[PDB]
Design a binder for this molecule. Structure first.
Ligand code: ADN
Ligand code: ADN
Lengths: 256, 259
């Protein structure tokens, strides 16, 4: 990361280095590198900041998790490369189990990811190591879940997830929250709560909200998670990007 | 193995596979995978189809290439993984030479890219194997081109290209045509003709266009080229995206299977 701190693409470049090493540590899938670029472009368009529609979604999600009877947080190759410590934090803050859930499971991937998480907590409870259950509707390898993790969860957080799984989880009766910079992806459109923000900002922001809501009443929380409309939240994100586009055009370098 | 053709995201997933196989073959760099994703995001915004402003730029690019005296088509790692066959097809249909130009050049990636191309034509000549001419304004390892290729070219096609490189060629007096799904990238803004469409739809369509216009009159060809506005095209692309976002926001997208 040898670039002036004043570089406008400072952080973006920094995480791009992180995602590359992720694959270098053998935990980030190649498809994960591609998904990362999808994120980069939408983040650039959005403004690399947590927009209002996102703060809104995170509020409802934290409220929703606080009421969960068995909340679970899913971790994949990208999460492990970008926010390995922050995901352990969010999981402690919401008293939620941690499950390694990969679309493409392998003995190495799981081990490496569990190892990466154990670098910030060698004691934390990590599920999905030995997955016995299956998410209905998915190909055997892609629908693996842990008898004690997602399989029994009522509210689940699946960040940077493939649309088929999000949909399948909703179909099996799980309430699904996702973090996804692409508001037009199947997953973003299928989730009950869609947080359109970079996970590097969303995760510490939610750990914050969980503190700011730690002493909330089950009534206050029910009011929150009760007034949330994911549809209007998605439409606003789209409108935001549209307005962001109008201005990005009247700026930068032009040639004529 | 492959994606079930019935899967609605078939094409999207097919090409993700191809770019992945490309890196597996040593032609594509890891960062090429990330760049593929950036393209996909913009494709999500345009709606994953060829829009009229793109078709418009495509006809202009073909017209210009057919009128060119020393046309050259550049090939990089992402190009090699996604449209190796169509790249060769386009070059022949435009009677242009092919040159390998990479961001991270190594003897292995060049070879592997060369081999891939030859699998569709063991006969085609490939420039850029060991380029010796340096284009000023670029870092040492990023600006060497082939003396008999881009160095002497008048019209150059540089798809999925770095802005600095697109910008450098323009500065060397080359008429630059690019294919880039991001209408706001430096490359899209600096190129003379910007084709905002996915290269997997663009190259096949241009091949078809080169054959169709292979017999046009210089009068027609010069008219097409003469009356083409790249700025207007980029703005028309942006307007299409902005109206599409407007429409979708109004209709709503939550829980919709398709858009
Ligand atoms: N750093 C990130 N933060 C949040 N979402 C991301 C990030 N990188 C990639 N994604 C999302 O992952 C999705 C694909 O699984 C993409 O739609 C993209 O928006
Ligand atoms: N398949 C593709 N077709 C056209 N342009 C692409 C594709 N993939 C990536 N790009 C573009 O190439 C640039 C990165 O080299 C990005 O700005 C992106 O818009």
């Amino acid at each position: 990361v040898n670039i002036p701190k004043s570089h406008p693409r400072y952080w973006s470049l920094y995480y791009r280095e992180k995602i590359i090493e992720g694959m270098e540590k053998g935990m980030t899938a190649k498809a994960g590198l591609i998904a990362h670029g999808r994120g980069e472009a939408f983040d650039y368009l959005i403004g690399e900041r947590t927009i209002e529609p996102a703060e809104r979604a995170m509020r409802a999600a934290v409220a929703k998790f606080l009421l969960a009877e068995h909340p679970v947080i899913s971790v994949n190759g990208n999460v492990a490369a970008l926010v390995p410590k922050e995901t352990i934090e969010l999981a402690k803050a919401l008293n939620a189990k941690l499950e390694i859930n990969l679309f493409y499971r392998t003995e190495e991937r799981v081990r490496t990811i569990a190892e990466e998480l154990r670098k910030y907590d060698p004691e934390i409870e990590i599920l999905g190591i030995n997955p016995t259950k299956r998410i209905p509707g998915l190909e055997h390898e892609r629908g693996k879940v842990d008898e004690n993790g997602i399989w029994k969860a009522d509210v689940v957080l699946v960040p940077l997830e493939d649309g088929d799984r999000t949909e399948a989880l909703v179909r099996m009766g799980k309430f699904v929250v996702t973090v996804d910079l692409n508001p037009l992806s199947r997953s973003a459109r299928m989730a009950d709560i869609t947080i359109v923000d970079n996970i590097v900002r969303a995760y510490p922001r939610m750990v914050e909200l969980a503190r700011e809501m730690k002493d909330y009443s089950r009534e206050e929380l029910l009011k929150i998670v009760g007034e949330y409309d994911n549809g209007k939240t998605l439409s606003d994100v789209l409108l935001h990007i549209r307005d962001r586009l109008t201005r990005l055009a009247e700026e930068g370098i032009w040639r004529r």
